[PDB]
Amino acid sequence: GSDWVIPPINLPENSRGPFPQELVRIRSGRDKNLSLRYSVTGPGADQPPTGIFIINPISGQLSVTKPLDRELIARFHLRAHAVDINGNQVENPIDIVINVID
Amino acid sequence: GSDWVIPPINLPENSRGPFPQELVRIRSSLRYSVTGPGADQPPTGIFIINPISGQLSVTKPLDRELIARFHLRAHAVDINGNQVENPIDIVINVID
Numbered sequence: 001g002s003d004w005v006i007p008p009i010n011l012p013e014n015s016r017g018p019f020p021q022e023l024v025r026i027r028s029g030r031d032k033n034l035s036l037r038y039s040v041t042g043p044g045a046d047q048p049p050t051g052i053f054i055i056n057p058i059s060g061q062l063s064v065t066k067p068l069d070r071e072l073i074a075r076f077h078l079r080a081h082a083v084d085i086n087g088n089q090v091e092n093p094i095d096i097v098i099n100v101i102d
Numbered sequence: 103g104s105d106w107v108i109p110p111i112n113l114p115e116n117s118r119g120p121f122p123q124e125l126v127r128i129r130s131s132l133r134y135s136v137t138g139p140g141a142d143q144p145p146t147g148i149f150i151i152n153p154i155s156g157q158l159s160v161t162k163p164l165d166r167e168l169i170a171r172f173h174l175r176a177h178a179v180d181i182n183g184n185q186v187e188n189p190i191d192i193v194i195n196v197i198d
């Protein structure tokens with residue numbers, strides 16, 4: 001559809017994993033027509049604290065890399081991107097919210 | 103329009119509820135509706151959506167026997183009833 005938000009993901013606090021732990025798959029149906037590469041930006045991804053969340057560039061699978069405590073940041077606001085071979089975005093970026101729950 | 107895909111919703115089989123039980127919120131002023139088997143097509147009224155918030159809920163415990171996976175479509179219209187964006191597919195798996 002033309003523009004819908006991805007439902008927030010709830011992640012239990014101080015999970016035992018193991019890590020990396022897959023959370024959800026974020027991708028576009030356009031990837032069945034064009035070669036697309038997925039990326040994630042925002043605090044937790046490429047902004048502090050870095051490397052907590054990663055996304056598989058081909059599948060769109062989003063994963064957590066370590067246990068998370070709620071004291072410092074209890075909610076992360078990321079943005080997933082879908083880009084063609086020249087790097088042009090083929091979808092408007094989409095917001096991803098990860099809530100750390102106790 | 104956009105073609106981002108909404109992640110499948112996994113719902114435990116024969117849940118205790120209480121009911122209605124909140125599942126997920128699907129949103130884009132606007133009014134939301136859901137169509138398909140389980141919503142407005144048989145078995146009707148199992149899944150319902152709040153027209154303002156987009157909150158999708160389930161109304162009773164579900165057994166996997168008859169239907170284990172539902173395919174619905176969420177719709178968004180302006181206050182005049184005009185569709186403002188392409189409908190979006192929603193998938194619900196009843197997990198045991």
Ligand code: IUM
Binds near residue numbers: 069070
């Ligand atoms: O376990 U504590 O925020």
